Design an enzyme around this catalytic site. Structure first.
Site, short mmCIF file in Angstrom:
data_model
loop_
_atom_site.label_atom_id
_atom_site.label_comp_id
_atom_site.label_asym_id
_atom_site.label_seq_id
_atom_site.Cartn_x
_atom_site.Cartn_y
_atom_site.Cartn_z
N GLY A 1 0.47 -1.15 -0.25
CA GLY A 1 0.04 0.03 -0.57
C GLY A 1 1.05 1.33 0.26
O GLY A 1 2.29 0.93 -0.09
N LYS A 2 -0.01 2.22 -0.23
CA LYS A 2 0.82 3.81 -0.07
C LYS A 2 0.00 4.96 1.09
O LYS A 2 -0.99 4.92 0.93
CB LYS A 2 0.86 3.72 -1.03
CG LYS A 2 1.64 3.43 -2.16
CD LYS A 2 1.44 4.36 -3.80
CE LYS A 2 3.04 3.95 -3.98
NZ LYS A 2 2.78 3.22 -6.11
N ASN B 1 0.21 8.60 3.42
CA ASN B 1 0.89 9.28 4.27
C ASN B 1 2.53 10.06 3.74
O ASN B 1 3.30 9.45 4.47
CB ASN B 1 0.72 8.51 5.30
CG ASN B 1 0.99 9.77 6.49
OD1 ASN B 1 1.10 11.21 6.48
ND2 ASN B 1 0.12 9.41 7.88
N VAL C 1 4.63 0.50 1.17
CA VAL C 1 5.07 0.16 1.84
C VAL C 1 4.55 -1.31 1.05
O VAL C 1 4.07 -1.71 0.20
CB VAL C 1 3.86 -0.42 3.57
CG1 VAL C 1 4.02 -1.83 3.73
CG2 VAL C 1 3.95 0.35 4.36
N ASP D 1 -5.11 7.78 14.28
CA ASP D 1 -5.30 7.17 13.18
C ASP D 1 -5.56 5.91 13.64
O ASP D 1 -5.63 4.69 12.56
CB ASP D 1 -4.32 7.44 12.16
CG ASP D 1 -4.88 7.09 10.79
OD1 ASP D 1 -6.52 7.21 10.82
OD2 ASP D 1 -4.37 7.25 9.48
C1 LIG Z 1 0.02 -0.82 3.78
C2 LIG Z 1 -0.50 -0.65 4.66
C3 LIG Z 1 -1.62 0.08 3.28
N1 LIG Z 1 0.77 0.32 4.98
C4 LIG Z 1 1.42 -0.06 6.15
N2 LIG Z 1 1.36 -0.90 6.36
C5 LIG Z 1 1.88 -1.41 7.47
C6 LIG Z 1 2.54 -2.68 7.70
C7 LIG Z 1 3.64 -3.31 8.36
N3 LIG Z 1 4.01 -4.66 8.69
C8 LIG Z 1 2.28 -5.30 7.63
N4 LIG Z 1 2.03 -6.32 7.15
C9 LIG Z 1 1.22 -6.81 6.38
C10 LIG Z 1 0.00 -5.53 6.32
CL1 LIG Z 1 -0.74 -5.66 5.28
C11 LIG Z 1 1.36 -4.03 6.30
C12 LIG Z 1 1.40 -4.32 7.39
N5 LIG Z 1 3.40 -0.74 8.27
C13 LIG Z 1 3.12 0.69 8.02
C14 LIG Z 1 1.80 0.94 6.84
F1 LIG Z 1 1.75 2.39 6.68
C15 LIG Z 1 -1.44 -1.20 5.25
O1 LIG Z 1 -1.49 -2.95 5.03
N6 LIG Z 1 -1.77 -0.82 6.94
C16 LIG Z 1 -2.97 -1.47 7.67
C17 LIG Z 1 -2.01 -1.54 8.96
F2 LIG Z 1 -0.37 -1.71 9.24
F3 LIG Z 1 -1.31 -0.01 9.69
F4 LIG Z 1 -2.12 -1.73 9.95
#
Ligand SMILES: CC(C)(Nc1nc(-c2c[nH]c3ncc(Cl)cc23)ncc1F)C(=O)NCC(F)(F)F
Length: 289
Positions: free
Chosen positions: A15-16, A18, A22, A135
């Site tokens: 994802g993207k 802020n 990632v 958030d």
């Molecule tokens: C890819 C996306 C938009 N952003 C981020 N993911 C992770 C991150 C850290 N470990 C992860 N493992 C799996 C996944 Cl799907 C995401 C992450 N860490 C920081 C992020 F900004 C996301 O999925 N956010 C949900 C969150 F992690 F915050 F709960």
């Protein structure tokens, strides 16, 4: 121990937002594809202000060690100081929002409360360090497995000033306004109490099982009128909150869980419950069930 950029094999975009992106990567120094799968965050457009905020997020995440907080793994400096990469654990079940949307009512009320308790505990631990998440939403909670969820994305996290109980954002960016406390909407004031208000919104999301027509943006837009646009949405949402317009009780949600949500949604910042109290209350509901 250090992470070499040359050994980070790209797998998939996660994802993207802020100002960052990632990716899912395999950290493979042995070059035999047996390496650990990790989540890698980097800045997309890296200005001196963005680097400064990214470094602060890295320091915040590294200082946190709790079962319900996503694990910091390291930093990769191979591209130089101005192009850092934050290395984190990869949670393959993804976000609680996607997980709940998929698995719907096959996750019972007992299970939703196990997740609620873990979110409270992670938030309480975060508060002991004087950190304000800003958030809290099901989209920002990750599922490790069927029995464990963790708070993710510390990109918006603020450290409270030494002499104050709130952090004031002078120039706000993209804001999740339908999760915001009234003082955050009107004065851009963030605190443990505003994180508690967003937690009440998280509890709501959980008990609606992420039904699209029942989402906080859909419910609030129907209450203010779908004809409202831009800054007029914020103007009307503030006046609605001031006159006690709140999200409805989700269909089939226990009365007691709705009361917890309504206590979190108090206009008086000092009257909102504490995360320590919420975890005690939710553990008691779980035990009773
Ligand atoms: C890819 C996306 C938009 N952003 C981020 N993911 C992770 C991150 C850290 N470990 C992860 N493992 C799996 C996944 Cl799907 C995401 C992450 N860490 C920081 C992020 F900004 C996301 O999925 N956010 C949900 C969150 F992690 F915050 F709960």
């Amino acid at each position: 121990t250090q992470f070499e950029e040359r050994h980070l094999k790209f797998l998939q975009q996660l994802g993207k937002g802020n100002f960052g992106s990632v990716e899912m990567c395999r950290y493979d120094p042995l070059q035999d594809n047996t390496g650990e799968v990790v989540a890698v965050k980097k800045l997309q457009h890296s200005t001196e202000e963005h680097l400064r905020d990214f470094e602060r997020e890295i320091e915040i995440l590294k200082s946190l060690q709790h079962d319900n907080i996503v694990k910091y793994k390291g930093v990769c400096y191979s591209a130089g100081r101005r192009n850092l990469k934050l290395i984190m654990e990869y949670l393959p079940y993804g976000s609680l929002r996607d997980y709940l949307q998929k698995h719907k009512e096959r996750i019972d009320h007992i299970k939703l409360l196990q997740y609620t308790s873990q979110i409270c505990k992670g938030m309480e631990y975060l508060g002991t360090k004087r950190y304000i998440h800003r958030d809290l939403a099901t989209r920002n909670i990750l599922v490790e497995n069927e029995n464990r969820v963790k708070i993710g994305d510390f990109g918006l996290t603020k450290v409270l000033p030494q002499d104050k109980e709130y952090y004031k954002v002078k120039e706000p960016g993209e804001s999740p306004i339908f999760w915001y406390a009234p003082e955050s909407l009107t004065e851009s004031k963030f605190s443990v109490a505003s994180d508690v208000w967003s937690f009440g919104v998280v509890l709501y999301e959980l008990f609606t099982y992420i039904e699209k027509s029942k989402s906080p943006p859909a419910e609030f837009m129907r209450m203010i009128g779908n004809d409202k646009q831009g800054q007029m949405i914020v103007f009307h949402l503030i006046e609605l909150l001031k006159n006690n317009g709140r999200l409805p009780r989700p269909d089939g949600c226990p009365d007691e869980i709705y009361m917890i949500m309504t206590e979190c949604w108090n206009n008086n910042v000092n009257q909102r419950p504490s995360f320590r109290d919420l975890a005690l209350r939710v553990d008691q509901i779980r035990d009773n069930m």
